[PDB]
From a paper:
The asymmetric unit includes four copies of Nb82 with almost identical conformations (Cα RMSD <0.30 Å, pairwise among all four chains, including 117 Cα carbons). Nb82 bears the classical immunoglobulin fold with two β-sheets of four antiparallel β-strands (β1–β3–β8–β7 and β6–β5–β4–β9) and a smaller β-sheet made up of two parallel β-strands, β2 and β10, that elongate the β6–β5–β4–β9 sheet. The fold is decorated by three π-helices, two of which are in the epitope-recognizing CDR1 and CDR3, formed between the β3–β4 and β9–β10 loops, respectively. The third π-helix is on the loop connecting strands β3 and β4. CDR3, the usual major contributor for antigen recognition and specificity, folds as a random coil with a π-helix of seven residues that folds back onto β6–β5–β4–β9 sheet. Notably, the CDR1 and CDR2 present a positively charged patch suggesting that Nb82 favors an interaction with a large negatively charged surface on the NaV. The crystal structure of Nb82 reveals a long (15 amino acids) CDR3 for a llama-derived Nb that could possibly underlie the nanomolar binding affinities observed for the Nbs to NaV1.4 and NaV1.5. Nb17 is characterized by a Tm of 76 °C and Nb82 by a Tm of 66 °C, suggesting both are relatively stable protein suitable for functional and structural characterization. Notably, Nb17 undergoes reversible temperature denaturation, whereas Nb82 undergoes irreversible denaturation.
Voltage-gated sodium channels, NaVs, are responsible for the rapid rise of action potentials in excitable tissues. Here, we generated high-affinity anti-NaV nanobodies (Nbs), Nb17 and Nb82, that recognize the NaV1.4 (skeletal muscle) and NaV1.5 (cardiac muscle) channel isoforms. These Nbs were raised in llama (Lama glama) and selected from a phage display library for high affinity to the C-terminal (CT) region of NaV1.4. Kinetic experiments by biolayer interferometry determined that Nb17 and Nb82 bind to the CTNaV1.4 and CTNaV1.5 with high affinity (KD ∼ 40–60 nM).
Numbering used by the authors: 1 to 128
């Protein structure tokens, strides 16, 4: 049983960066896979990045390839999403989800534990 809270959202100029964090509360943080997802208004929620509990490299959507880095600090019960070279198309609510690493699922939508999401807006309008 784990509770998740995203933070680090904002409104950022095109070409800028953010780092989202997803803080877990509950037992055995080290036994959970964690996944980042994003949802734009009127669109299906989509996979961004996932990180496991082994040495293995994380997984990334083709939509972010190379721009994004997911990482975990097991001591801080925190997963991060560094987001570089942001574009307007990256605007969405970003969500973190957790599932026990031994459980196999067909979709990220089957992860049991979700945060409330953090809003990311990327704007080429120089209000910066």
């Amino acid at each position: 049983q784990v509770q998740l809270q995203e933070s680090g959202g904002g409104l950022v100029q095109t070409g800028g960066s953010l780092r989202l964090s997803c803080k877990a509360s509950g037992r055995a943080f080290a036994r959970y896979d964690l996944a980042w997802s994003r949802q734009a208004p009127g669109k299906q929620r989509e996979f961004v990045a996932s990180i496991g509990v082994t040495r293995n490299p994380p997984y990334y959507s083709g939509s972010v390839k190379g721009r994004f880095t997911v990482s975990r600090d097991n001591a801080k019960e925190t997963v991060y999403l560094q987001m570089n070279d942001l574009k307007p198309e990256d605007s969405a609510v970003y969500y973190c989800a957790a599932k026990d690493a031994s459980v196999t699922v067909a979709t990220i939508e089957d992860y049991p534990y979700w945060g409330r999401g953090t809003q990311v807006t990327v704007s080429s309008e120089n209000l910066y």
